[PDB]
Structure formats: structure tokens, C-alpha cells
Design a protein around this ligand. Structure first.
Ligand SMILES: *[C@@H]1O[C@H](CO)[C@@H](O[C@@H]2O[C@H](CO)[C@@H](O[C@@H]3O[C@H](CO)[C@@H](O)[C@H](O)[C@@H]3O)[C@H](O)[C@H]2NC(C)=O)[C@H](O)[C@H]1NC(C)=O
Ligand SMILES: *[C@@H]1O[C@H](CO)[C@@H](O[C@@H]2O[C@H](CO)[C@@H](O)[C@H](O)[C@H]2NC(C)=O)[C@H](O)[C@H]1NC(C)=O
Ligand SMILES: *[C@@H]1O[C@H](CO)[C@@H](O[C@@H]2O[C@H](CO)[C@@H](O)[C@H](O)[C@H]2NC(C)=O)[C@H](O)[C@H]1NC(C)=O
Ligand SMILES: *[C@@H]1O[C@H](CO)[C@@H](O[C@@H]2O[C@H](CO)[C@@H](O)[C@H](O)[C@H]2NC(C)=O)[C@H](O)[C@H]1NC(C)=O
Ligand SMILES: CCCCC/C=C\C/C=C\CCCCCCCC(=O)O
Ligand SMILES: *[C@@H]1O[C@H](CO)[C@@H](O)[C@H](O)[C@H]1NC(C)=O
Ligand SMILES: *[C@@H]1O[C@H](CO)[C@@H](O)[C@H](O)[C@H]1NC(C)=O
Ligand SMILES: *[C@@H]1O[C@H](CO)[C@@H](O)[C@H](O)[C@H]1NC(C)=O
Ligand SMILES: *[C@@H]1O[C@H](CO)[C@@H](O)[C@H](O)[C@H]1NC(C)=O
Ligand SMILES: *[C@@H]1O[C@H](CO)[C@@H](O)[C@H](O)[C@H]1NC(C)=O
Ligand SMILES: *[C@@H]1O[C@H](CO)[C@@H](O)[C@H](O)[C@H]1NC(C)=O
Ligand SMILES: *[C@@H]1O[C@H](CO)[C@@H](O)[C@H](O)[C@H]1NC(C)=O
Lengths: 43, 183, 336, 410, 49, 49
């Protein structure tokens, strides 16, 4: 979260120069997730 | 406490009789419960304020005990506590919610400027210097003694002086000498 | 260093504007609660009056009848310029001493603005919220210049002699000799004081120089000053932030209720808001009354402290300061 | 009470006599005059999907979500004969009067004889296996009849589910609020005279349902609608709520009412420095209040709450003279006469550089009003100076010793 | 502080579980909000004391 | 708790209270000294000869 990873902005507003506690849908801190790799065909 | 009973708190009336004669059972229960909650909260606030006032009054009563013991049963030596200036005598009378004090003090009205000295010594080899006791060494040379609270020159004797060590700020008397300094 | 608080911030609330925020329907509903708003206003007015009389009594009791000039060259080898008005003045106050400048500058106080606060607020925050919420901070009884006058006149106050116990005589004795007699009265002989004049003056000057740079986080009386300022700000913050309480309504603002509901539902939600805000105002009035009596008692204690430590030497160990008390100086502080 | 401030003071105290003092009174409230209205050209909300085809059943309800469009609510309501409506945290008049961020409509064919099964606390088959209303948003449930058969095509019959379970009725699957039933695939096969239960062998699921018949009567429908506020930059507005656009360039600095892309309120607008995001069009503080606006003219306007000037009355009872103190405001904003003091702009005082020792009407900052035997005078509190004594340069000192005295009683 | 939790404040019960198991959604919101407001006012009074 | 007669009796008995003499710092002795002489000794102790 220190780089604001996976943060969804509020839909119809904005905030300027404050710190706000917002309840919504966020990814958990330290979650590795799942990594997917797309390769290239045989050549 | 008396005027909080007229608060409707959101109900149609602040009296139970109008609610009972204006609505049905469920609405009566709702309005009466509204009044009950409002009055209970007001009573809680009243209890809190009475507790605060009672503890404050107890502390002030202890302060009044201290004031009686200091000013009425004695003469306070620290200025400004009992009254203004030099406290003389105090009288305490009953008051509707406490005690009322009459601090009689010493109030000077006319002041004159007098030349004063810290102390006096002669030129004897073991020089004995004297200092005033609750007063000043005034003049206008010939030195007299006066009280601190009233100007009245008086002869310098052993009844108003105390022997002190020699200081460089003390006046060195050579021509005339008080009986404390004479031998 | 000791801080005694003598006053709190004087706040008056417009009950109608606070409760209804200038809405005609809310005012029509609040007309049933006019007496409670009137009682709130009257209680706040009485508390502010009592505060003004307490401040007047404080500054009447610490007045001096005689004063000597204590400029450099007359105080001897004692540097007392930290307690005096600077010869070059930049404080905006022509009577404020340097130590009062250091006290006031290092405290975080939001400037309310008694002259153009409304204009400054509308030109470009619990101070700009006075004209929004519906309250107002009342200015103190005396301007800071008069308080600085009263506190600076106590530094060079002429009192009776050390051996003459009383307050009926005005002995014009220099500060060096007064310090000499004060040190003699605690159990130091005249020979020691005569042989150690320069060392005593140096130690006094060192004590005052260390007194200069001592308003930092470690200092506890400065923390008391900031705590009084924070208590005033917290009262204002509670008063301003209680207006966002919905109290169970669909919104904490009258406009949304008016534009989202029909007549009966508007009446019910606005009545909930009115009851909540009236209860909040009653709690605020009770808190202000309690703080007012506490400040009055503490101001009386400040009167006693001035009369004991500043205008005389205390023989009671531990009351004024630790150990043997020599001399005390009082300076104006925020709220005390 | 409305004549002047001293009469308002008398009315507030509810007596014809009040003691002398400085009393706070009601502030000079500035009611909003003028309108700033900014709205987009928008488009018509597409309701033709509801009318183009047969309505579905209650277990297979269709949903329409509308955003950033205008709709003719009167034309839509004129096509239905509403039998009843129940609304939560909103009213139909407010729906026709105001704007909202989104509008969601859940419509299905529903018989009016089963109207009690769609209500709040119902525990019948409709609320258990077909449709449960969601109350997380302001909602209105509308049950109406369709008078003209050319508006919406008539379905064959009314159909619903009575129970939906896996193996035994003790393992029934209940529907969620605003969601579809687990037995939707089984209930898609329909219920008629011959078919009244449907079973799946793979998952084991079973669904039982009932039916009505529609024969030469009007169609009865159910509409469950819901709205949201403050969740979008654009708004859904009925066409009766759309007004003419005005401009803010002439209403700056005063309390005005605004309607900015459906967001309504009152406030004070100033040409402020652009902050926040342009695309979101709205800047909010930590208390969910509008503090800024990115307008379509390229300027950013900062929105401020409407403020009231504090007013105080300086009343003297004996001389029956009153003066007005406007706390902490210059005399130009208010526009003897007005003058600027340390405590604001006063009206009704005369300045004569008078100095008084004690006075009973303190205005603050060592200023006070003194009655003159006739208008009150602006005076200053006197600071008496102590008697200055200069020590002499010798081994002697001067002392002031009393020669006369009195006895003072404290 | 402990006994202010048994105040119904006008609700059908002073416990949330009975309100949850006795009423529908909207009435649950109303009664729970009533309890919330009562308990918040009680906590404010406790803090002042 | 007390009727006003008892309170006034308590406050009245303090006016004529006899105490230790001015030169005897204490409250163990009761010196029957007239009011004029007590005032004389009280004025003597503040700096009047
Ligand atoms: C999602 O897709 C599945 C298919 O994988 C759908 O299930 C299928 O639904 C049809 C129509 O209801 C079933 O056909 C019927 O079969 C019965 C015999 O069991 C026959 O008597 C009827 O006349 C009709 O032909 C089909 O069997 C069924 N298949 C499976 C594997 O369940 C399902 O309905 C779809 N979901 C939705 C919501 O449409
Ligand atoms: C963003 O907010 C911070 C915090 O309030 C602002 O920093 C303040 O700036 C003022 C100068 O006007 C200082 O007096 C304060 O001491 C600062 N506060 C803190 C906590 O540092 C900052 O100015 C704001 N930025 C903008 C662009 O408005
Ligand atoms: C909204 O719909 C109503 C119909 O209910 C429209 O009113 C009709 O408008 C037409 C054309 O202007 C007239 O010929 C009719 O006489 C009107 N009344 C009826 C009952 O049909 C109304 O114009 C629509 N509003 C908008 C903005 O399009
Ligand atoms: C729910 O109702 C819709 C109609 O509102 C059904 O959609 C139709 O489905 C049939 C075959 O599945 C198509 O031939 C039609 O063209 C569809 N019409 C529309 C308007 O979509 C849908 O099948 C129903 N769902 C269930 C599970 O019964
Ligand atoms: C009407 C059936 C017979 C009533 C007497 C029998 C039992 C009483 C016990 C429980 C009743 C609970 C259901 C209430 C019905 C509400 C209507 C609906 O849910 O739509
Ligand atoms: C007294 O102290 C001030 C700083 O507080 C200093 O500027 C001044 O020179 C000092 N005076 C003497 C005589 O030391
Ligand atoms: C509607 O009902 C009328 C009644 O006679 C009938 O004539 C008409 O055909 C019907 N329309 C449709 C689309 O079924
Ligand atoms: C809006 O403007 C049009 C002309 O552009 C005018 O006919 C109409 O009456 C106006 N409406 C209002 C409400 O002012
Ligand atoms: C508003 O301010 C912007 C710059 O911030 C400026 O370009 C514009 O001309 C101003 N408009 C008005 C009407 O003052
Ligand atoms: C009052 O008049 C005097 C003399 O003209 C002037 O110095 C002073 O500033 C005036 N005060 C006010 C508040 O106008
Ligand atoms: C105000 O005080 C000064 C002393 O500082 C005095 O000379 C003057 O007479 C006083 N004025 C009044 C009106 O009392
Ligand atoms: C002291 O003052 C009073 C009152 O003015 C006067 O009657 C009396 O004569 C004065 N006494 C002296 C000694 O000046």
C-alpha cells in the first residue's frame, strides 16, 4: 500500500490534500496473488 | 429541573393526558416511551451537575475552614491572603449559602520620603554594628528609629536594635553615637 | 517554571442558527423549543460575565503601588533584560517583554481574529467555522498590552524592607541589595555574600540564560500551557463536529432531508436532528460552566501565588519552588 | 421583535425590561438568492426494452440500470394504473423533483391478488424463492396495471416458484435480496396444468411452482426501483427537474443555490486555484461536503458554506440607549455612524477618546461603552500607573513611611 | 458504565441478537440505530464525568 | 442539617473568642485580654511603635 498498489478510486468525486479512511474493495497487504506468463510458439 | 418537563422530545404533546386522549395504543406507547427516555436523560444530567456542585461546595467549605483558622483565630503575617495590606482582625458572619468575612486591615493614606540607612557602626577595633528590628534608621547626622507602618522618630536603643556583623554598606558614625554603640 | 491558568476561551452560541442552519421549516419546528434555546443563550451569557469579572479581579489584585526602573546599569551585575520590554520592539505589542515573546511565539495558537475575522474567512479550521456552525469566540476583557503592563510592573515593584515584615512601606532598595538580603534571610552570612558577589551575579545570569532556551518538549509547564490551548480547541472542535451527527436520520443536513422526503418524514427527521443538537448544546453549556468555575478557582490560586512569591519571599519550603526561595518573576501567558 | 436588535433582545428574554449588558442576538442570515445551474445535454433513457417484449416472471426478473440520461417520468407513469406503492427513505415526489446518480428498475409480470407476498415482512413462496427486495438503497416498490394491451405484449400466464430444495424440503434454497433463485434453470421450464414440479438428476435439485392464467384482462406488473446519491459525476434526472442553465460569473462571493450536474445545494462560489481531479468534477472534504467544482467553462470554483455575520447588542437600561456590535467584520461589509474598532464594526457609539477607570459594558480588547447623560460613548479602560521611585546613589536609601492611616474592610 | 448497556432506549430489546431474530431488515436498522444513539450519548456522558 | 439559630450561635461565639497572646505563638493557652488591648497588640505587630 505504500505505492498504492491496486487502489480503486471513488467513482464520482475526488479529494485533495487530506487523509481519509475509506471502506470498499481493496487487495490485502502482502498478498502475492497469482502470476501468469504468456509464452511464444515454437519456431 | 422544573422546566425540562415541558419538553415534548418530538412527541405531539409534553403531557401524558393529551397523548392518551389523542392516539391509539401503539402510538401512545411510542410517544410515552419518547417522553420517558427524554426525562430519564434529563434526570441523569441533573444528577451529574448536582454531584459536581456538591464536590465543589465541599472543597470551598474546606477553604472556608482554612480561612477561619487563619484570619479569625489568628493574625495572618502573609499579606494579601486575608485582606489587603497589613491584616489586623477579621470577623465571620453567617451567609445564606456559606460564610461571610470582614477583613479589617491597615490602610495607609499619606506617605513621606525619609532617608534611611541599613545599619550603624562606630570605629572601634571590634566594630559592633546594629540593625533595626521591624523598622528603619531614619534621619533629617543624627539617626533616629521609626516604625515601618508609621513615621515617628524615636531614640535608638537596645529595645529596637539587634547586633549584626560589619558590612561595607553600613554608616560609620564618628561624631554622635547611640547608646547601643556607645561604651 | 510554573503555569497557572486564570481563564478559558469565552464562547457564545446562536442556538437557532446552530440547530437549524437558517432553514424556515426547521425554524418552524424549533419554535416549539424556543425556551430551551433562550436558556442556553442566557446560561452562556452568565458564564461569560462571570469570566469577565474573574479576569478583572485577577488584574485588580496583582496591581502595584510603587515601581522602580530596572534598566541596565542600575540593577548592578544582574542581567534582568529578559524580564523587561525590549528597547527595539518588533512584537506588535509595545509593552510585551522578551520572555513573554518567547512564551507566546512557541505555543501553537490559532489566531481567532477579533477585527476582520469574517473578512479574512471569506477572502480565502475552527476559527472560520464560527460563522458556519453558529458560535463566536468572544474577545478577552483586556488587550494583551494591558496584561503586559500589569505583569511588567510587578518585576520592578518596590516593597518593604526584608527586616520590616509588612506592606505599608516602600523602600527604594536596588535589586542587588534586595537579592543580598533575600540570600541572607535563608541562612547565608554577610561575609559569604560580600566575598561572593561576582559569583552570585554570574550564577543568577546563568540561571536566566538557561531560562531563555527552556520552552521545549521536555519542559512540563509549557506542556500545561499547550494543554490549556488544546482544551479550548477541543471544546470548539466538539461544538463544530457535533453538527455532522445524523442522530438516526437519513442525512445530517436539512437540505437533503427537504429534497428527498415528503412532509411528514421531513418533520420526523428534522425533529430528530433538533433533539440531538439541543442535547449536544446542553452538554456543551454544562462543560463550559464546569470549566469556568475551575478557571476562576485557579485564578484565585494565581492571585495567592503572586502575593506570596512575587511580592515577598516565601518561608514555606516547596510552595514557590524547590529548596529555599529567593525571588520569583511572573510573566503573561496564554490563558493564564 | 423584527423591528431592530434591541426588540429582539427583549423578545428573547420574554420581558419588557432586561439588565444592561452586551448581549449576543441572532446573526444576519443571508438567504440564497440567484441560481447557478450547470447540466449536460444528455440523452433519453432507453426504456424500450421493457415495452418491446413480453414481461418475465418474478423468479426471472429483468433489470434496467440508467446512468447519465434524462427520462420523461410523466409519460412513463401515464402508461400504468398504479394500485399501490411502498417507498423506503425516499418519496415518489422527491423522485420526480430531484436527480440521482443511478436508477435501477426491476420489473416482472406479477398478479395483483398476490400483492401481500411482495411486502416487507412476508414469508410466503414469493419472498422465499422468487424475489426479496433489497433495502441497502432508497427503494420504491410499485405495483400497477397496464390498461392498454398494445403497450406491453401480454404473457401467457403468471408463474412463480413455491419451493426449491435439493433432496428434502428441509434443505430448501432461499433467494437472496436482489439476486436470482438457485432454481432458475428448473423454473425456466415453466409451470402449467400438466407441469408443476421439475427435477434434475445430476445435482439432485428440485423446483415446485404454481401458476395463474391471463385471459382477456389487463396486465399487472411489479416494479422495484432503487436510486443512489453521490456515486457518480453525472446524474439521472426526470425531464421536469431540468432547468435553464445560468452562469456563476455574476453571483460570486454571495450565498446562492446551485444545481451542478444534478448535485443540488446552496453555498458561496469563488474563483479558486484548481485542485483535485478535473475528470471527477467534484472535490469533497473529509466530512462528505462539496468544497470545489470543476466547471465546463474551464474555471475551478471553490464552494464555501453560507455564513452569517455575528450581531451583538450593547444595551443600557437606565438611559434606554442601544448600540449594535458586529463581531469581527469591517464596516464595508455592513454597508453616530459605523466605525472600526478592535472588536469589529460598531454602530451607535460616539468616539471621543474618553478614558474610564471602570465601566459596566465591556466590549473586549480594553474597550467599553460608557453611557452619557444622549448616546453611549466608545471609551477605553484606564491603566493607572504605579508611583515611580528612583533609588539614590549612596549607602543610604529613600523609604516611603506612612504618616496617616485608615482602616479598610475587605 | 456496565449497567448502561441494559437500556433498551425504546427498542424491543437491549440486545442486538433478539432484534436480529425478531424483526425484518428496516425495523432492525431502526432499532439498532436507536441503541447506537443511546449508547453513544451514554459514552459521551461517561467521558465528561 | 442545622437550623439558622445554631449556625448563628457558632458564628457569634467566634467574635469573642479568647486566644493565646500575641507574643505566644500557639493555641494552648487562653489569655483573657480585652478587645482594646488585643487590637493594640495586633497593631504593634505590623510595624507601629
Ligand atoms: C444453463 O445451461 C444448462 C445446460 O447445460 C440448462 O439446462 C438445460 O435446460 C433445458 C431447458 O430447461 C433442459 O431441457 C429439458 O430437458 C427435459 C429432460 O430433462 C425435457 O423434458 C424438456 O422438454 C427440456 O428439453 C436440459 O435438460 C437442461 N440440461 C441440463 C444438463 O441441465 C440450464 O437451463 C441453463 N440455465 C438457464 C438459467 O437457462
Ligand atoms: C496540504 O495540507 C498541509 C497540512 O495542513 C499544509 O501544510 C501546512 O501549510 C501551512 C502553510 O500555509 C503551514 O502553516 C502548516 O504548518 C502546514 N501544516 C503541516 C502539518 O505541515 C499544506 O500547505 C497543504 N497544501 C496545499 C497546497 O494546500
Ligand atoms: C413527456 O410525455 C408527455 C406525455 O405524457 C408529453 O406531453 C405530450 O406532448 C405531445 C407533444 O408535445 C403533445 O402532442 C401531447 O398533447 C402531450 N400530452 C399528452 C398527454 O400526450 C411531453 O411533451 C413529454 N415531455 C418531453 C420533454 O418530451
Ligand atoms: C427470462 O426472461 C427473458 C425474457 O425477458 C428470456 O429471454 C428470452 O429467451 C428466449 C429463449 O431462452 C429467447 O428466444 C428470447 O429471445 C429471449 N428474450 C429476451 C427479451 O431476452 C429468458 O430466457 C428468461 N430466463 C429464464 C431462465 O427463464
Ligand atoms: C393465514 C394462515 C393461518 C394462520 C394461523 C396459523 C398459524 C399462525 C402462525 C404463524 C403465522 C406466520 C405467518 C404470517 C402470515 C403473514 C402473511 C404472509 O406471509 O404473506
Ligand atoms: C544580558 O543578556 C542579553 C541577552 O539576554 C545580552 O544581549 C546582553 O548583552 C546581556 N548584558 C550583559 C551586561 O551581560
Ligand atoms: C387488444 O384488445 C382488443 C380488444 O378487442 C383487440 O381488438 C386487440 O387486437 C388487442 N391487441 C393486441 C395487440 O392483442
Ligand atoms: C428557458 O429558456 C427558454 C428560452 O431559451 C424559455 O422559453 C423558457 O421559458 C425558460 N425557462 C425558464 C424556467 O426560465
Ligand atoms: C478565474 O481564474 C482563472 C485562473 O485561476 C482565470 O484564468 C480566469 O480568467 C478567472 N475568471 C474570472 C471570471 O475571474
Ligand atoms: C477616535 O478618535 C481619535 C481622535 O481622532 C482617534 O485617534 C481614534 O483612532 C478614534 N478611534 C476610533 C475607534 O475611531
Ligand atoms: C487614568 O490613569 C492615569 C494614571 O495612569 C491618571 O493620571 C488619570 O487621571 C486616569 N484617568 C481617569 C479618567 O481616571
Ligand atoms: C488623616 O486623615 C484624616 C482624613 O482626611 C484627617 O481627619 C486627619 O486629621 C489626618 N491626620 C493626620 C495626622 O494627617
Amino acid at each position: 500500500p505504500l505505492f498504492a498498489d491496486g487502489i480503486i478510486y471513488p467513482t464520482g468525486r475526488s479529494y485533495s490534500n487530506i487523509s481519509l479512511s475509506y471502506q470498499g474493495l481493496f487487495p490485502r497487504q502482502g498478498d502475492l496473488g497469482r502470476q501468469y506468463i504468456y509464452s511464444v510458439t515454437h519456431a | 429541573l422544573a422546566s425540562e418537563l415541558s419538553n415534548t422530545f418530538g412527541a405531539i404533546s409534553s403531557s401524558i393526558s393529551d397523548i392518551l386522549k389523542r392516539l391509539d395504543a401503539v402510538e401512545q406507547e411510542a410517544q410515552i416511551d419518547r417522553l420517558i427516555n427524554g426525562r430519564l436523560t434529563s434526570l441523569n444530567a441533573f444528577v451529574a451537575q448536582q454531584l459536581v456542585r456538591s464536590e465543589t461546595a465541599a472543597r470551598s467549605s474546606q477553604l472556608a475552614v482554612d480561612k477561619v483558622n487563619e484570619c479569625v483565630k489568628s493574625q495572618s503575617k502573609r499579606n494579601g491572603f486575608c485582606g489587603s495590606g497589613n491584616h489586623i482582625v477579621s470577623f465571620v458572619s453567617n451567609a445564606p449559602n456559606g460564610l461571610y468575612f470582614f477583613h479589617v486591615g491597615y490602610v495607609p493614606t499619606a506617605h513621606i520620603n525619609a532617608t534611611a540607612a541599613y545599619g550603624l557602626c562606630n570605629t572601634e577595633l571590634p566594630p559592633r554594628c546594629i540593625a533595626p528590628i521591624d523598622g528603619y534608621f531614619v534621619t533629617n547626622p543624627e539617626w533616629y528609629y521609626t516604625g515601618s507602618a508609621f513615621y515617628n522618630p524615636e531614640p535608638i536603643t537596645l529595645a529596637n536594635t539587634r547586633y549584626v556583623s560589619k558590612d561595607t554598606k553600613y554608616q560609620e558614625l564618628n561624631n554622635k553615637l547611640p547608646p547601643p554603640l556607645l561604651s | 517554571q510554573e503555569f497557572i491558568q486564570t481563564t478559558i476561551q469565552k464562547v457564545t452560541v446562536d442556538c437557532k442558527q446552530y440547530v437549524c442552519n437558517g432553514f424556515e421549516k426547521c425554524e418552524q419546528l424549533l419554535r416549539e423549543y424556543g425556551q430551551f434555546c433562550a436558556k442556553i443563550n442566557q446560561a452562556l451569557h452568565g458564564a461569560n460575565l462571570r469570566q469577565d469579572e474573574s479576569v478583572s479581579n485577577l488584574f485588580s489584585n496583582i496591581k502595584t503601588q510603587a515601581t522602580q526602573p530596572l534598566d541596565a546599569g542600575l540593577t548592578g551585575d544582574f542581567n534582568l533584560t529578559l524580564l523587561q520590554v525590549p528597547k527595539v520592539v518588533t512584537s506588535q505589542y509595545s509593552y510585551r517583554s522578551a520572555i513573554e515573546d518567547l512564551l507566546f511565539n512557541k505555543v501553537t495558537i490559532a489566531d481567532p481574529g477579533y477585527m476582520q475575522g469574517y473578512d479574512e474567512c471569506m477572502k480565502q479550521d475552527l476559527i472560520c467555522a464560527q460563522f458556519v456552525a453558529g458560535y463566536k469566540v468572544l474577545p478577552p476583557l483586556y488587550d494583551p498590552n494591558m496584561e503586559s503592563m500589569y505583569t511588567t510592573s510587578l518585576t520592578g515593584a518596590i516593597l518593604g524592607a526584608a527586616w520590616t515584615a509588612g506592606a505599608s512601606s516602600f523602600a527604594a532598595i536596588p535589586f542587588a541589595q534586595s537579592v543580598f538580603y533575600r540570600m541572607n534571610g535563608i541562612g547565608i552570612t554577610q561575609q559569604v555574600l560580600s566575598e561572593n558577589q561576582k559569583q552570585i551575579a554570574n550564577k543568577f545570569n546563568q540561571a536566566l540564560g538557561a531560562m531563555q532556551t527552556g520552552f521545549t518538549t521536555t519542559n512540563l509547564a509549557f506542556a500545561k500551557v499547550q494543554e490549556a490551548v488544546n482544551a479550548n480547541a477541543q471544546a470548539l472542535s466538539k461544538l463544530a463536529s457535533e453538527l455532522s451527527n445524523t442522530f438516526g436520520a437519513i442525512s445530517s443536513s436539512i437540505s437533503d432531508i427537504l429534497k428527498r422526503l415528503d412532509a411528514v418524514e421531513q418533520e420526523a427527521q428534522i425533529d430528530r436532528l433538533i433533539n440531538g443538537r439541543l442535547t449536544s448544546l446542553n452538554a456543551f453549556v454544562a462543560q463550559q460552566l464546569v470549566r469556568s468555575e475551575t478557571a476562576a478557582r485557579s485564578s484565585q490560586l494565581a492571585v495567592d501565588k503572586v502575593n506570596e512569591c512575587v511580592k515577598s519571599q516565601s518561608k514555606r519550603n516547596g510552595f514557590c519552588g524547590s529548596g529555599n526561595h529567593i525571588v520569583s518573576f511572573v510573566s503573561n501567558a496564554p490563558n493564564g | 421583535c423584527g423591528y431592530d436588535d434591541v426588540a429582539q433582545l427583549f423578545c428573547s428574554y420574554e420581558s419588557f425590561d432586561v439588565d444592561s449588558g452586551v448581549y449576543s442576538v441572532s446573526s444576519f442570515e443571508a438567504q440564497p438568492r440567484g441560481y447557478f445551474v450547470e447540466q449536460p445535454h444528455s440523452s433519453e433513457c432507453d426504456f424500450s426494452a421493457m415495452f418491446s417484449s413480453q414481461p418475465p416472471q418474478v423468479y426471472n426478473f429483468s433489470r434496467l440500470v440508467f446512468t447519465n440520461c434524462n427520462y420523461n417520468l410523466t409519460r412513463l407513469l401515464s402508461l400504468f394504473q398504479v394500485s399501490e406503492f411502498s417507498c423506503h427513505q425516499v418519496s415518489p415526489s422527491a423522485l420526480a423533483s430531484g436527480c440521482y446518480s443511478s436508477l435501477t428498475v426491476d420489473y416482472f409480470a406479477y398478479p395483483l391478488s398476490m400483492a401481500s407476498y411482495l411486502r416487507q415482512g412476508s414469508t410466503g413462496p414469493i419472498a422465499q424463492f422468487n424475489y426479496k427486495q433489497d433495502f441497502t438503497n432508497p427503494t420504491c416498490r410499485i405495483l400497477a396495471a397496464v390498461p392498454s394491451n398494445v403497450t406491453i405484449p401480454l404473457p401467457q400466464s403468471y408463474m412463480w416458484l413455491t419451493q426449491c430444495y435439493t433432496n428434502s424440503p428441509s434443505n430448501s434454497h432461499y433467494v437472496e435480496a436482489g439476486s436470482y433463485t438457485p432454481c432458475l434453470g428448473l423454473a425456466s421450464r415453466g409451470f402449467n396444468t400438466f407441469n408443476s414440479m421439475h427435477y434434475d438428476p445430476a445435482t439432485g435439485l428440485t423446483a415446485t411452482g404454481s401458476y395463474q392464467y391471463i385471459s382477456e384482462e389487463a396486465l399487472e406488473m411489479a416494479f422495484i426501483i432503487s436510486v443512489q446519491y453521490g456515486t457518480d459525476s453525472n446524474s439521472v434526472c426526470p425531464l421536469q427537474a431540468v432547468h435553464n442553465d445560468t452562469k456563476v460569473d455574476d453571483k460570486l462571493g454571495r450565498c446562492i443555490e446551485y444545481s451542478l450536474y444534478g448535485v443540488t445545494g446552496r453555498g458561496v462560489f469563488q474563483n479558486c486555484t484548481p485542485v483535485g481531479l478535473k475528470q471527477q468534477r467534484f472535490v469533497y472534504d473529509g466530512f462528505d461536503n462539496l468544497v470545489g467544482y470543476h466547471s465546463d467553462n474551464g474555471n475551478y470554483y471553490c464552494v464555501r458554506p453560507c455564513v452569517s455575520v455575528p450581531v451583538s447588542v450593547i444595551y443600557d437600561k437606565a438611559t434606554n440607549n442601544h448600540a449594535t456590535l458586529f463581531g469581527s467584520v469591517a464596516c464595508e461589509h455592513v454597508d453616530a455612524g459605523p466605525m472600526q474598532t478592535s472588536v469589529g464594526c460598531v454602530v451607535g457609539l460616539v468616539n471621543t477618546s474618553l478614558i474610564v477607570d471602570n465601566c459596566q459594558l465591556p466590549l473586549g480588547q480594553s474597550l467599553c461603552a460608557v453611557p452619557a447623560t444622549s448616546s453611549l460613548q466608545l471609551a477605553t479602560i484606564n491603566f493607572t500607573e504605579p508611583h515611580m521611585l528612583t533609588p539614590i546613589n549612596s549607602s543610604r536609601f529613600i523609604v516611603e513611611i506612612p504618616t496617616n492611616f485608615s482602616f479598610g474592610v475587605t
